[PDB]
Amino acid sequence: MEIRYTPKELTKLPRTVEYKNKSVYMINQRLLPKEFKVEKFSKVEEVAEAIKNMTVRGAPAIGAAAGFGLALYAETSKAKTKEEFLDGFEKAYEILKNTRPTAVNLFWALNRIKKLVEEHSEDPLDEIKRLIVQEAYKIADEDVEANLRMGHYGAEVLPEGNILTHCNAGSLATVHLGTVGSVVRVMHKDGSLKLLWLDETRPVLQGARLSAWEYSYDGLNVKLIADNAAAFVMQQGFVDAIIVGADRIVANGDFANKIGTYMLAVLAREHGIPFFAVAPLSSIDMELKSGKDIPIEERSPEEVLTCGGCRIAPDVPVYNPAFDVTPHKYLTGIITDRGVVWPPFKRNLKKLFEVN
Amino acid sequence: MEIRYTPKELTKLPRTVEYKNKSVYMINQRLLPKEFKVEKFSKVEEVAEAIKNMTVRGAPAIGAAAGFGLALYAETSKAKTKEEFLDGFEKAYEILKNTRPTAVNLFWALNRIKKLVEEHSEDPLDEIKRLIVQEAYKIADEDVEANLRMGHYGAEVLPEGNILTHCNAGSLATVHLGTVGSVVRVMHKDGSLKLLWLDETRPVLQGARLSAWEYSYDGLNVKLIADNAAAFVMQQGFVDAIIVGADRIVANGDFANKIGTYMLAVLAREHGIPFFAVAPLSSIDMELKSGKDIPIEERSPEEVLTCGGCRIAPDVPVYNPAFDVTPHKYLTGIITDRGVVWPPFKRNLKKLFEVN
Numbered sequence: 167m168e169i170r171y172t173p174k175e176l177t178k179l180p181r182t183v184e185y186k187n188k189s190v191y192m193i194n195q196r197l198l199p200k201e202f203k204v205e206k207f208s209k210v211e212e213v214a215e216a217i218k219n220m221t222v223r224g225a226p227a228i229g230a231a232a233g234f235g236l237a238l239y240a241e242t243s244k245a246k247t248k249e250e251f252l253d254g255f256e257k258a259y260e261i262l263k264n265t266r267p268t269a270v271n272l273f274w275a276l277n278r279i280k281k282l283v284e285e286h287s288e289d290p291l292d293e294i295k296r297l298i299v300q301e302a303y304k305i306a307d308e309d310v311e312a313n314l315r316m317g318h319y320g321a322e323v324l325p326e327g328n329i330l331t332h333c334n335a336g337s338l339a340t341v342h343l344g345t346v347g348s349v350v351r352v353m354h355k356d357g358s359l360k361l362l363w364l365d366e367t368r369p370v371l372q373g374a375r376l377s378a379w380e381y382s383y384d385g386l387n388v389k390l391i392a393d394n395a396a397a398f399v400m401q402q403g404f405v406d407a408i409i410v411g412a413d414r415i416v417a418n419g420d421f422a423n424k425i426g427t428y429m430l431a432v433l434a435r436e437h438g439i440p441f442f443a444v445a446p447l448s449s450i451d452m453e454l455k456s457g458k459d460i461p462i463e464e465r466s467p468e469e470v471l472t473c474g475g476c477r478i479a480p481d482v483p484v485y486n487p488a489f490d491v492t493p494h495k496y497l498t499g500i501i502t503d504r505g506v507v508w509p510p511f512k513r514n515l516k517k518l519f520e521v522n
Numbered sequence: 523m524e525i526r527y528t529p530k531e532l533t534k535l536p537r538t539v540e541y542k543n544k545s546v547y548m549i550n551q552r553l554l555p556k557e558f559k560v561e562k563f564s565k566v567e568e569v570a571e572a573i574k575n576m577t578v579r580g581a582p583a584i585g586a587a588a589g590f591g592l593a594l595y596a597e598t599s600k601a602k603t604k605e606e607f608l609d610g611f612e613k614a615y616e617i618l619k620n621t622r623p624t625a626v627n628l629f630w631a632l633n634r635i636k637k638l639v640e641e642h643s644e645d646p647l648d649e650i651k652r653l654i655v656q657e658a659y660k661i662a663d664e665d666v667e668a669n670l671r672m673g674h675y676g677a678e679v680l681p682e683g684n685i686l687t688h689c690n691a692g693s694l695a696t697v698h699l700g701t702v703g704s705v706v707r708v709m710h711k712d713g714s715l716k717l718l719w720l721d722e723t724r725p726v727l728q729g730a731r732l733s734a735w736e737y738s739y740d741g742l743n744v745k746l747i748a749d750n751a752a753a754f755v756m757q758q759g760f761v762d763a764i765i766v767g768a769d770r771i772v773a774n775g776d777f778a779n780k781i782g783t784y785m786l787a788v789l790a791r792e793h794g795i796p797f798f799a800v801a802p803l804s805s806i807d808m809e810l811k812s813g814k815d816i817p818i819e820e821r822s823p824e825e826v827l828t829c830g831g832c833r834i835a836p837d838v839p840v841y842n843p844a845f846d847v848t849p850h851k852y853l854t855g856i857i858t859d860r861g862v863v864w865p866p867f868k869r870n871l872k873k874l875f876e877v878n
Contacts, residue, residue: 199836366826366835368724368748374826374835382838389839390826392724393749394782398846401784402818426750428757429785432792470722470730470748476830479722479730480555482738483745490754 167322167505169314173342176317176351177384180204181310181342182227185234185302188241192222192231195338199379209242210235210258217265217272224339229271230306232262236279237302240295248291255283255298274448275305309341312446312503317348320409320444320501321356324349327406330363330396333424334372335411335444336380345411345444347380349501354386362388363405365396367424369469369486393426400437408434409501412445419494419511420457421445425487431496443492444501452519457491464488523678523861525670529698532673532707533740536560537666537698538583541590541658544597548578548587551694555735566595566614573621573628580695581769582665582802585627589658591618592635596654604647611639627804631661665697668802668859673704676765676800676857680705682714683762686752688721689780690732691767691800701767701800703736705857710742718742719761721749723780725825725842749782756793764790765857768801775850775867776813777801781843787852799848800857808875813847820844 184191190207196219197203205221207213213235216222222231239258245251259280266272279301286297329350336347343351353359362381367373374390381388391399399405408430415421421443434441454460467484471477500507500515504522507514540547546563552575553559561577563569569591572578578587595614601607615632622628635657642650685706692703699707709715718737723729730746737744747755755761764786771777777799790797810816823840827833856863856871860878863870 200833363841365750366724368722368750371829371834378838379836382836389841390835391841392781392826394721394724394780394785395841395843395846397785397788398781398843399841401846424750425748425754429750429753429789432753433785433788436788470746473727473829474832474834476832477556478727478830479746480735480738482734485745485747485751485755487751487754490751490757 167315167318169318171314171318171352171355173310173314176343176348176355177337179337179380179383181306182224182338183222183231183234183306183341185237185306188238190231190234190238192216193338194221195223195376196221198338199375210239210261213238214261214265217262225269225271226309226340227338228266228269229275230302230309230341232265232272233275233279233302233305235262236276237299240298248294251291251294252283252287278305306341310343313340313343313345313348315503316345316444316446316501317343317352319503319506320349320442321352321358323499323501323506324353324409324442325406325440326358326360328361328363328404329353329359330365330399330405330408330430331377332365332373332410332426332430333367334376336377338376338380339411345446346409349409349444350381350386351384354384359386362386363396363399364388364390365393365426366390367426368393369473371474372424393429396430397433400433400439405437405439407440407442409442409444412443412449413489414460415443415445415450415500416454416456416460417452417512417515418456419497419500419515420460420491422457422460422489422491425490428490428492431492435496440498441496442499442501443497446503447518447522450502450515452515457493460491462487462489523674525674527708527711529666529670532699532704532711533693535693535736535739537662538580538694539578539586539590539662539697541593541662544594546587546590546594548572549694550577551579551732552577555731564594565598566591566617569594570617570621573618581625581627582696584622584625585631586658586662586665586697588618588628589631589635589661592632593655593658596651607647607650608639608643634661662697666699669696669699669701669704671859672701672800672802672857673699673708675859675862676705676798677708677712677714679855679857679862680709680765680798681762681796682716684717684719684760685709685715686719686721686755686761686764686786687733688729688766688782688786689723690728692733692736694732694736695767701802702765705765705800706737706742707740710740715742718744719752719755720744720746721752721782721786722746723782724749727830728780749785752786753789756789756795761793761795763796763798765798765800768799768805769845770816771799771801771806771856772810772812772815773808773868773871774812775853775856775871776816776847778813778816778845778847781846784846784848787848791852796854797852798855798857799853802859803874803878806871808872813849816847818843818845
């Protein structure tokens with residue numbers, strides 16, 4: 167696998183989150199798709215609020231934001247001793263930790279820096295600062311390079327033609343390029359993406375609001391449809407392959423993804439349309455044996471009773487599972503940042519983990 | 523196989539379209555679910571504007587409205603000569619015909635009354651008026667009694683427990699009670715309807731805006747979901763059967779219904795869930811052999827780009843097929859106003875028509 171493209175050749179978008187001149191810069195994902203704006207944040211409180219705000223979203227972008235919040239702390243701290251600095255650093259760690267206490271990459275990112283600083287607490291204070299900043303760049307850059315690899319691996323295995331996806335697994339859901347987004351960006355550059363179908367993805371509408379915007383921004387050929395219509399476009403012969411992201415892949419290859427993914431897996435199979443998940447190794451949870459061990463999160467009934475700003479239903483009971491679980495047998499393959507995993511997934515995933 | 527309930531035992535709702543005391547009364551479907559309002563119309567043009575407007579919707583309800591438009595003409599005409607009446611009657615007929623030149627029941631309703639006014643053109647004039655008014659009540663009543671019959675036929679064959687449906691095929695889609703609406707109202711009265719799952723049915727959201735409203739009005743235990751979640755509620759074992767309406771059933775049983783119906787059909791099958799269409803004999807087009815002979819109708823991109831009027835997407839291309847076509851093999855049976863049709867549908871449908 168040779169990486170043939172740089173990020174800048176694949177997208178015209180800036181990084182979802184960037185650190186430059188003692189400032190954290192974030193695409194404002196609350197204003198999309200009406201307005202495209204890069205917010206500039208100069209205090210750790212502003213960064214924390216922007217995580218709580220969901221000004222930034224997508225697990226790795228949130229991680230990088232938090233990590234760059236500590237970098238910002240390091241370059242900005244008015245501390246006159248190492249003791250003061252470390253005390254401030256702990257305060258800053260805690261402020262950033264308690265934005266979304268559940269979001270997993272947030273915790274990884276902060277703890278990775280925290281742990282590096284404790285390990286180096288006896289180094290000179292300029293060297294601790296240097297290390298923190300360096301670490302925050304490493305977190306961001308690792309996401310981007312995982313995405314670069316995924317894109318090229320995925321682009322080898324998907325057919326040319328018409329691809330269909332679900333939700334938002336683009337540049338906005340990552341530091342840069344996307345998971346799905348990387349694959350379709352490489353395909354687009356290669357001339358092999360004729361059409362990208364985008365499920366709007368109710369209830370939260372990240373397909374319509376986010377995917378439709380970024381893929382359009384980059385000049386991909388795109389068509390936005392109601393979720394109801396994915397089966398129709400498959401039935402009419404309009405889809406050559408389906409690619410989705412994953413919130414969590416477990417040991418046998420079962421995976422959790424935005425609600426509707428399971429629907430697509432079953433329709434793909436009915437039409438013999440190749441069906442792929444794409445995610446980095448860090449999204450594979452080898453602790454859980456199968457899909458039945460993934461706990462189902464339900465979100466507010468307001469996400470269904472409303473649609474954008476508009477209230478479109480009477481006060482009635484709702485069921486709003488955020489994620490469904492797709493059994494592994496529906497997968498043609500799993501595209502990762504270390505190559506494509508083929509059936510049997512159990513065996514090939516555990517291989518992948520031993521050799522990477 | 524006895525009718526065990528009257529319309530008024532099954533629903534608290536008035537007729538979607540009613541005629542009394544020289545006024546056409548229609549439920550304002552434009553203002554639901556926020557506001558329940560019955561509009562009063564007193565001129566033919568008021569009634570035509572309401573059909574063009576989609577104040578009224580659903581094929582048989584549009585039918586009845588048209589017919590009552592002629593009744594309203596009949597009882598409102600100053601005309602002195604018999605030939606002055608027939609001039610303003612062909613004028614009324616032409617105004618009503620030019621509202622939706624495409625929705626079929628409107629034409630049957632209007633042509634049916636016109637051929638009854640040609641076949642008695644040499645009666646008195648108090649007599650022709652009485653016949654027009656009377657024929658219009660026939661058209662409306664005939665829908666309601668057909669619904670009553672589907673209702674009881676359907677309740678016989680669906681299991682007790684948890685039912686899932688799609689779009690609006692309730693009271694508001696008809697003169698009264700509904701197709702699907704009638705079946706679930708009869709089950710609710712028998713106490714066999716434990717839970718009714720309602721797909722909101724993007725993009726037009728008639729599940730959320732209309733079905734959730736009317737079924738809740740009648741105290742049915744209801745739960746609203748995003749279309750993406752149907753597959754998932756089937757997977758978790760929450761659905762004992764699925765019943766949908768039909769816009770058009772052809773001679774082999776293939777049928778066209780609101781976009782997403784085919785998605786449900788495929789999922790029902792994967793989970794071994796019984797899957798029924800319900801429609802009157804008049805919805806069956808014995809002149810088309812199969813579903814490829816049903817032309818595919820696109821509607822406005824704004825239906826997808828907006829949600830209840832709220833803009834949710836950037837300006838990107840959309841595909842908005844308004845209906846899909848479900849292959850007959852997905853059907854457990856077809857519930858009609860003259861009994862349930864079983865496989866093999868082609869053979870049994872033409873036996874249904876032979877004995878009527």
